[PDB]
Amino acid sequence: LTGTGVLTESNKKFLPFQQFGRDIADTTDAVRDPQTLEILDITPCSFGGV
Amino acid sequence: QIDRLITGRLQSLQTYVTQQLIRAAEIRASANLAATKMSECVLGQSKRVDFCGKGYHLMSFPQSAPHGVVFLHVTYVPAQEKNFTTAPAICHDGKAHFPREGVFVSNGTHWFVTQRNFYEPQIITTDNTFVSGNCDVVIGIVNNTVYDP
Amino acid sequence: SALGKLQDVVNQNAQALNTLVKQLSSNFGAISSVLNDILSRLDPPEAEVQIDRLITGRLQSLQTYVTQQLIRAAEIRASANLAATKMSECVLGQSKRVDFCGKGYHLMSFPQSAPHGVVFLHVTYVPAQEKNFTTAPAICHDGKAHFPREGVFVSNGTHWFVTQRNFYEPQIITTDNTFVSGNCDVVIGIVNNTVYDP
Amino acid sequence: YTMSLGAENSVAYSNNSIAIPTNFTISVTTEILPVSMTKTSVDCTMYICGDSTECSNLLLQYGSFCTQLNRALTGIAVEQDKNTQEVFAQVKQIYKTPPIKDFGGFNFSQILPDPSKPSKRSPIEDLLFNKVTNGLTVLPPLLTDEMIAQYTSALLAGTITSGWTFGAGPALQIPFPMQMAYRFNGIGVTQNVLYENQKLIANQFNSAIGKIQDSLSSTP
Amino acid sequence: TRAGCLIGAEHVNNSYECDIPIGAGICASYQSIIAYTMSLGAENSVAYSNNSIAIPTNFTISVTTEILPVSMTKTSVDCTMYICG
Numbered sequence: 118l119t120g121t122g123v124l125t126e127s128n129k130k131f132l133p134f135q136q137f138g139r140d141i142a143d144t145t146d147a148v149r150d151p152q153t154l155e156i157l158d159i160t161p162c163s164f165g166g167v
Numbered sequence: 168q169i170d171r172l173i174t175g176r177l178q179s180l181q182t183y184v185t186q187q188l189i190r191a192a193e194i195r196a197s198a199n200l201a202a203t204k205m206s207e208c209v210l211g212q213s214k215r216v217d218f219c220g221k222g223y224h225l226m227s228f229p230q231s232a233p234h235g236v237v238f239l240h241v242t243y244v245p246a247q248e249k250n251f252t253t254a255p256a257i258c259h260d261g262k263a264h265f266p267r268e269g270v271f272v273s274n275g276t277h278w279f280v281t282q283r284n285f286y287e288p289q290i291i292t293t294d295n296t297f298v299s300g301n302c303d304v305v306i307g308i309v310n311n312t313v314y315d316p
Numbered sequence: 317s318a319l320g321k322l323q324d325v326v327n328q329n330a331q332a333l334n335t336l337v338k339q340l341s342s343n344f345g346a347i348s349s350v351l352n353d354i355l356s357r358l359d360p361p362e363a364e365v366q367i368d369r370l371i372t373g374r375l376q377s378l379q380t381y382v383t384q385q386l387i388r389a390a391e392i393r394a395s396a397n398l399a400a401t402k403m404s405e406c407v408l409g410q411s412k413r414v415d416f417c418g419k420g421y422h423l424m425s426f427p428q429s430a431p432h433g434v435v436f437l438h439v440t441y442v443p444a445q446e447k448n449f450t451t452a453p454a455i456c457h458d459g460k461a462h463f464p465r466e467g468v469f470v471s472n473g474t475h476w477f478v479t480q481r482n483f484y485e486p487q488i489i490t491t492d493n494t495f496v497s498g499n500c501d502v503v504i505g506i507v508n509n510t511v512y513d514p
Numbered sequence: 515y516t517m518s519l520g521a522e523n524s525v526a527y528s529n530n531s532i533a534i535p536t537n538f539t540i541s542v543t544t545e546i547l548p549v550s551m552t553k554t555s556v557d558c559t560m561y562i563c564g565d566s567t568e569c570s571n572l573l574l575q576y577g578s579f580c581t582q583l584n585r586a587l588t589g590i591a592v593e594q595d596k597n598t599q600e601v602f603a604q605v606k607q608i609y610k611t612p613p614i615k616d617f618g619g620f621n622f623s624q625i626l627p628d629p630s631k632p633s634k635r636s637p638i639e640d641l642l643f644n645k646v647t648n649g650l651t652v653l654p655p656l657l658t659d660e661m662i663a664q665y666t667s668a669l670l671a672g673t674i675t676s677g678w679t680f681g682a683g684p685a686l687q688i689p690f691p692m693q694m695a696y697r698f699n700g701i702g703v704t705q706n707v708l709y710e711n712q713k714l715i716a717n718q719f720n721s722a723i724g725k726i727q728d729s730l731s732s733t734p
Numbered sequence: 735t736r737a738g739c740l741i742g743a744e745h746v747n748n749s750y751e752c753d754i755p756i757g758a759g760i761c762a763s764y765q766s767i768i769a770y771t772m773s774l775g776a777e778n779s780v781a782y783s784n785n786s787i788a789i790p791t792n793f794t795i796s797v798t799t800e801i802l803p804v805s806m807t808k809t810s811v812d813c814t815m816y817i818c819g
């Protein structure tokens with residue numbers, strides 16, 4: 118699963134069979150690191166209007 | 168393949184912008200109505216029927232709401248109406264008397280003049296009536312005395 | 317920037333026309349944006365594909381232009397219905413509607429033609445130079461309560477008068493500008509003053 | 515079923531009888547009107563293509579579609595702020611009520627701002643705010659909810675302390691049982707009726723304002 | 735700001751009328767470029783009491799302008815000629 122984002126620590130406690138996380142709009146906003154079983158939030162990079 | 172995705176996403180975005188423009192026109196019409204109600208019901212007393220609530224409009228109060236405005240219309244509703252026998256004019260001394268501001272009412276034996284939206288009977292005098300013509304023209308004129316102060 | 321509302325409509329229409337003219341310069345994925353170049357360069361089996369791409373791009377552009385033209389036509393029709401209402405109610409009559417025909421108490425209005433528009437000169441009455449007075453709802457006299465027929469009871473400190481509500485014009489409180497309803501025991505804030513009889 | 519419009523009310527018409535009201539009800543009703551929407555802005559290039567440069571190179575063949583979409587959304591976004599400006603900013607003087615709320619028995623605590631709340635909203639406005647629950651950006655509105663509440667507070671203070679005079683010029687103070695009498699004369703009822711029954715009208719008005727708050731709190 | 739980061743404008747504590755809207759109550763003006771929270775209106779406390787009234791002694795005849803658009807330029811596009819010539 119590839120993408121671009123800021124990977125921060127997450128307070129969402131996954132069940133052990135679940136790997137990724139999706140919001141209402143079906144975008145991957147939570148993920149599990151495969152090396153160390155920890156949950157990371159994927160915040161989109163902070164683009165804006167100039 | 169990217170051209171197919173581009174034309175699909177462009178069609179989706181054009182559809183979204185078109186329906187957003189239609190909803191923006193609807194919201195602009197509603198906001199013009201809300202500004203009209205702000206000017207005519209809050210900043211003044213409106214004679215327009217059902218524009219500022221049901222009943223005779225007294226005043227209105229604005230309240231902010233999330234993406235909206237709430238008008239509290241304070242209105243006057245008449246209640247507890249009562250039957251009376253009425254006449255268009257009073258015949259006295261060969262003259263026809265008509266109410267200056269109110270209406271002639273009778274409870275069965277005596278004739279009074281009252282304001283139209285509330286029962287407040289007063290003695291029919293020359294100060295609340297005016298004279299126009301004789302009694303031969305007005306259909307339904309009745310005979311009653313007219314007091315002179 | 318006084319005439320910005322008409323100039324906004326003119327600029328939007330001219331910009332929509334300029335965008336529609338500019339959209340002919342785009343090839344929309346074809347080899348060229350010029351139809352004569354495609355028709356002079358290619359056989360009809362592949363010129364059909366190139367012309368089809370140009371046709372669907374230009375048709376999408378034209379349908380988009382007609383869509384915002386209809387939306388702007390609805391907006392201009394709403395503004396013109398409002399302008400016709402203002403012409404009927406402010407110019408051809410005197411309006412009791414607050415802020416419909418200018419700021420203040422509306423007296424009359426003048427229409428003026430403008431390029432693709434109308435300018436209303438609203439002549440209104442603004443109150444000014446207000447003054448404090450001590451006021452009462454009613455006058456108690458001879459055990460009777462007197463209320464103003466059209467004005468309001470005011471006092472400059474020692475003497476009571478009745479005046480019209482939108483302009484200070486003090487007059488002697490008489491039986492001709494007051495009416496009697498009830499005694500003095502009911503009305504809250506009734507004051508004692510004489511009522512002259514002509 | 516076949517629906518029924520309304521209860522039949524045969525009005526007792528005759529050529530010499532009239533019905534005159536002997537009493538009145540001070541009725542307060544709510545009217546809710548939308549003013550603005552959420553100001554949304556879409557980056558057309560990022561929505562179609564994201565960060566793919568080949569996609570944007572192919573998107574440049576279609577011309578200025580993205581510019582038209584961005585300009586239409588910008589027009590909608592400034593139209594929402596213009597709508598809020600036309601609705602709420604109808605006064606250029608910020609009026610305040612006096613600290614003593616002596617209005618001849620009339621209670622406005624449910625519509626005046628609450629000093630105990632940090633949002634400076636009325637209890638009714640607080641209940642109203644409680645009852646409402648890829649290139650995409652949401653632009654904030656130009657007027658915050660605190661300033662819209664301040665505008666409504668100024669309008670309420672003007673219409674309570676000064677009548678309709680502040681909407682036509684300078685705010686001319688007038689006692690509220692006199693303002694009410696003027697409104698009574700605007701609908702064709704004499705001033706005496708208001709003055710004699712001022713306690714009953716104030717009680718009816720306060721009861722109706724409380725019923726408005728109860729009906730808003732009890733209807734989803 | 736709540737609208738975003740503003741670079742090149744000096745934030746001041748005074749409140750003025752809105753000249754250039756930034757958003758979330760922030761406006762910008764030129765005087766250098768300053769940014770501020772807007773002022774809604776001039777403050778005015780109405781001298782309310784239960785037995786005092788204010789009566790006007792004079793008047794101003796005020797004429798104001800109201801500009802309303804009526805029509806647009808009547809444009810017609812030959813669809814066949816626009817697409818194909």
Ligand SMILES: *[C@@H]1O[C@H](CO)[C@@H](O[C@@H]2O[C@H](CO)[C@@H](O)[C@H](O)[C@H]2NC(C)=O)[C@H](O)[C@H]1NC(C)=O
Binds near residue numbers: 274275277
């Ligand atoms: C209609 O109203 C008149 C005036 O109120 C009534 O006349 C009064 O009747 C009472 C009851 O007998 C007397 O005490 C008063 O002295 C009467 N006043 C006058 C001026 O005569 C009249 O009785 C009422 N008629 C009906 C049918 O109700």
Ligand SMILES: *[C@@H]1O[C@H](CO)[C@@H](O[C@@H]2O[C@H](CO)[C@@H](O)[C@H](O)[C@H]2NC(C)=O)[C@H](O)[C@H]1NC(C)=O
Binds near residue numbers: 258310
């Ligand atoms: C009202 O009074 C008028 C005049 O006082 C009455 O008219 C008279 O009617 C009688 C009877 O028909 C005639 O003899 C007179 O010549 C009439 N006088 C005039 C001046 O026309 C009228 O009848 C009365 N109406 C009622 C209902 O009592």
Ligand SMILES: *[C@@H]1O[C@H](CO)[C@@H](O[C@@H]2O[C@H](CO)[C@@H](O)[C@H](O)[C@H]2NC(C)=O)[C@H](O)[C@H]1NC(C)=O
Binds near residue numbers: 472473474475
């Ligand atoms: C309020 O107005 C009345 C009427 O204008 C004032 O009464 C006049 O006072 C002047 C000054 O002495 C006398 O010359 C007049 O004869 C008075 N007129 C009457 C009818 O008595 C009154 O003085 C004013 N009160 C105040 C406090 O200014």
Ligand SMILES: *[C@@H]1O[C@H](CO)[C@@H](O[C@@H]2O[C@H](CO)[C@@H](O)[C@H](O)[C@H]2NC(C)=O)[C@H](O)[C@H]1NC(C)=O
Binds near residue numbers: 456508
């Ligand atoms: C206005 O005049 C009324 C009537 O003269 C005054 O009422 C009187 O007040 C005295 C003093 O308390 C009582 O003894 C009388 O019985 C009252 N008479 C009536 C008919 O109520 C009233 O006090 C006066 N008000 C002012 C402010 O002077």
Ligand SMILES: *[C@@H]1O[C@H](CO)[C@@H](O[C@@H]2O[C@H](CO)[C@@H](O)[C@H](O)[C@H]2NC(C)=O)[C@H](O)[C@H]1NC(C)=O
Binds near residue numbers: 250526
């Ligand atoms: C005024 O009088 C009319 C006629 O007597 C009343 O109308 C009648 O009211 C009764 C009461 O229920 C009904 O049974 C009749 O069917 C009504 N008649 C008509 C033609 O509608 C009327 O109620 C009276 N108004 C008041 C306020 O008392």
Ligand SMILES: *[C@@H]1O[C@H](CO)[C@@H](O[C@@H]2O[C@H](CO)[C@@H](O)[C@H](O)[C@H]2NC(C)=O)[C@H](O)[C@H]1NC(C)=O
Binds near residue numbers: 714
């Ligand atoms: C007019 O209606 C009001 C209520 O709408 C009446 O006031 C009620 O009077 C009764 C008996 O006096 C009391 O028990 C109620 O508490 C009163 N209600 C309120 C809200 O104060 C009033 O009496 C009616 N007047 C007439 C002449 O019918």
Ligand SMILES: *[C@@H]1O[C@H](CO)[C@@H](O[C@@H]2O[C@H](CO)[C@@H](O)[C@H](O)[C@H]2NC(C)=O)[C@H](O)[C@H]1NC(C)=O
Binds near residue numbers: 621624
């Ligand atoms: C105006 O109405 C308010 C609210 O209905 C009244 O405030 C209530 O006062 C009672 C008695 O002290 C308290 O038990 C309630 O909790 C209060 N309600 C609220 C929402 O604070 C107030 O008394 C009325 N009168 C005035 C003059 O403000």
Ligand SMILES: *[C@@H]1O[C@H](CO)[C@@H](O[C@@H]2O[C@H](CO)[C@@H](O)[C@H](O)[C@H]2NC(C)=O)[C@H](O)[C@H]1NC(C)=O
Binds near residue numbers: 446779781782788
């Ligand atoms: C009417 O009198 C009131 C109270 O005396 C005046 O209100 C005061 O105005 C001064 C001057 O601007 C202020 O310094 C005070 O703070 C005001 N008091 C209050 C309670 O607001 C008012 O200006 C007078 N109106 C006229 C037209 O003279």
Ligand SMILES: *[C@@H]1O[C@H](CO)[C@@H](O[C@@H]2O[C@H](CO)[C@@H](O)[C@H](O)[C@H]2NC(C)=O)[C@H](O)[C@H]1NC(C)=O
Binds near residue numbers: 445791792793
């Ligand atoms: C009402 O205000 C008008 C302003 O339009 C006053 O008229 C001015 O009066 C002064 C003093 O005499 C003159 O210097 C001005 O030239 C007048 N202006 C105009 C346009 O005529 C008028 O005097 C004021 N009236 C009152 C009673 O205050």
Ligand SMILES: *[C@@H]1O[C@H](CO)[C@@H](O)[C@H](O)[C@H]1NC(C)=O
Binds near residue numbers: 151
């Ligand atoms: C995978 O290797 C990491 C390396 O630190 C280790 O901590 C972990 O126990 C191993 N197993 C799993 C299931 O992550």
Ligand SMILES: *[C@@H]1O[C@H](CO)[C@@H](O)[C@H](O)[C@H]1NC(C)=O
Binds near residue numbers: 306307308529530
């Ligand atoms: C009302 O009509 C009756 C007949 O139904 C008639 O006798 C009477 O004179 C009429 N009254 C008026 C005021 O027209």
Ligand SMILES: *[C@@H]1O[C@H](CO)[C@@H](O)[C@H](O)[C@H]1NC(C)=O
Binds near residue numbers: 504505
């Ligand atoms: C105004 O309030 C005062 C109390 O401050 C009271 O004494 C006076 O009677 C009231 N006047 C009216 C007209 O209500």
